[PDB]
Nucleic acid binder design. Structure first.
Ligand SMILES: Nc1ncnc2c1ncn2[C@@H]1O[C@@H]2COP(=O)(O)O[C@H]2[C@H]1O
Ligand SMILES: Nc1ncnc2c1ncn2[C@@H]1O[C@@H]2COP(=O)(O)O[C@H]2[C@H]1O
Lengths: 203, 74, 203, 74
DNA sequence: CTAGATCACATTTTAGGCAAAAAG
DNA sequence: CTTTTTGCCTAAAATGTGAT
DNA sequence: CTAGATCACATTTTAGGCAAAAAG
DNA sequence: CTTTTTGCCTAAAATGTGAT
């Protein structure tokens, strides 16, 4: 049993989002905060042309749609889209604030998560500023063995993902992601057969 | 060493379907289970997503999980 | 007069940092929070080889060295180095926490800044994922006319910076930054003579 | 329009050094100052970093600044 | 294909402390 | 007399070059 | 120089809902 | 009888190709 989160919830509207449905549209007015009760979502952004890019996946326990909560009339900073089907807690900017001064512990929990997210995001910049593409892929393959939905597998951690997607993560062409994977396979670093992949030497 | 890992599979109180696959794969003690991998278990006949899921949940509310890496066995 | 910040300060140790001196070493144990009373600093990270990269400049009013404050025994995530000479407020993880439950308004002010920083940082990723180098430069030239230390200038906002540095910002060679600047000069977008630059059409 | 911008430079209470450069550059009213740019002011003889700084600070504690873009003048 | 990285080094530019000069 | 602007100075830092 | 992007389309792989089959 | 595993199925999505 966990009281602080339990009390928080006793003040929210619950709403189910079907897989691949869009929870937050970049640009919209921001007046509301969301909380992932169950599932996993995708945080992405888009250029004028429509090319997409994945910042991070959030899972049960993680907060979403907070950035407007500190300055007024701010606009949503990125798409947030349901990876699986999600059940989501919702609560207003108006009311969340009333809550802080009742139990700041709750603001802490959000804030805790904020910080970690800056670290990840900062790092991804580093991935981009310093590593070649063959390299950026590597980092991202390891980060995946860290995720919840990652499966234990004899040689190391097993994951399910497309090349097309990996591109939205590492910022390169899908054709390119394919090419490295055939190389990483000669180099016995991975076992790749379909959306199905074995990451040797994690776990 | 550790205490829960010396108990029989029976101490997990599984369903008949989950219980019957474990006892037919030569997985007798809970210490044997936590070492086994998620993908490996799934290949075994009569064991599908829901049984694999029951196994992962009876271990999780009890501290443990799959694919654990252990020493000093027997 | 501003009471909330004023009270905060009444609980800090003040320390002067000489220009270019290093305030935070990436990796160190984290037990302390800093606050920029006067000046400007540089947030950067490094790869194994020593190549450098600038995340953002912080100015009077901005917080630094917070990320470890939420999980214990965390390690500093990046260099923070004095751009000018700085006068800096310092306060411990131990004691800042005691403060929150005395006036959460103060945690809010930090948190406000946290969010904005995620937006900038996220965006920079976008700059990298979507824009060519000629392009990433452009965005960064505009962001500079937004800074405090930016000077009003007839044609637009004027800035003082090196090509070498710009590279640590936009992630490319110094030779390359030079090349675009001679092009942006034919294209009458800028006036570049030395560390001295006129950004046409801002202001 | 705006009220403070119709006042003479004298209402800023400047130092003699700052006062003497403004009145010799044909900058008579405060509305004229806020339109002028930082770099432009600096070129003017006898006006260096500290005078430019006094000008920027007497305007800042009083809402205003330099390089402002204005309409309806005179 | 295209957009950048890379090398060493001769030349150019900057920081910033001081003193003479001008202003008050 | 002091305060502030300007010209002046050199080691150290910043830069262009351009074929591959 | 090197590391990637790019094009269209013939072929391969996946999601996921259902039913037969097996287990309880 | 119910519950759970497995094989089976097709439109839709994912992929390799390779010279420039
Ligand atoms: N870099 C990031 N890493 C993780 N999550 C993010 C990142 N950027 C934005 N988000 C989330 O995406 C949301 C988009 O809309 P909001 O600005 O309302 O709040 C944002 C955050 O919850
Ligand atoms: N992406 C960023 N943008 C702005 N500031 C940052 C960023 N990443 C880190 N910082 C600051 O740099 C500091 C490095 O050490 P800390 O982790 O103690 O706290 C960090 C923040 O204050």
């Amino acid at each position: 049993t966990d009281p602080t989160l339990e009390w928080f919830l006793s003040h929210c509207h619950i709403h189910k989002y079907p897989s691949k449905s869009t929870l937050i549209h970049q640009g919209e007015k921001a007046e509301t905060l969301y909380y992932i009760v169950k599932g996993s979502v995708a945080v992405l952004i888009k250029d004028e042309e429509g090319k997409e890019m994945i910042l991070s996946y959030l899972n049960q326990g993680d907060f979403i749609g907070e950035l407007g909560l500190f300055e007024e009339g701010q606009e949503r900073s990125a798409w947030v889209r349901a990876k699986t089907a999600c059940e989501v807690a919702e609560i207003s900017y108006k009311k969340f604030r009333q809550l802080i001064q009742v139990n700041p512990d709750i603001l802490m929990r959000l804030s805790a998560q904020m910080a970690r997210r800056l670290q990840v995001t900062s790092e991804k910049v580093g991935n981009l500023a310093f590593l070649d593409v063959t390299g950026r892929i590597a980092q991202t393959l390891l980060n995946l063995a860290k995720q919840p939905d990652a499966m234990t597998h004899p040689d190391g951690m097993q994951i399910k993902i497309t090349r097309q997607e990996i591109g939205q993560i590492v910022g390169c062409s899908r054709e390119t992601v394919g090419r490295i994977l055939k190389m990483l396979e000669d180099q016995n670093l991975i076992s790749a057969h379909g959306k199905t992949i074995v990451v040797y030497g994690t776990r | 060493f550790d205490p829960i890992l010396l108990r029989p599979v029976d101490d997990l109180e599984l369903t008949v379907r989950s219980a019957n696959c474990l006892k037919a794969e030569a997985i007798h003690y809970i210490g044997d289970l936590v070492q086994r991998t998620e993908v490996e278990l799934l290949k075994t006949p009569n064991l599908g997503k829901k049984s694999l899921t029951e196994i992962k949940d009876v271990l999780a509310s009890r501290g443990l999980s799959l694919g654990m890496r252990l020493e000093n066995w027997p």
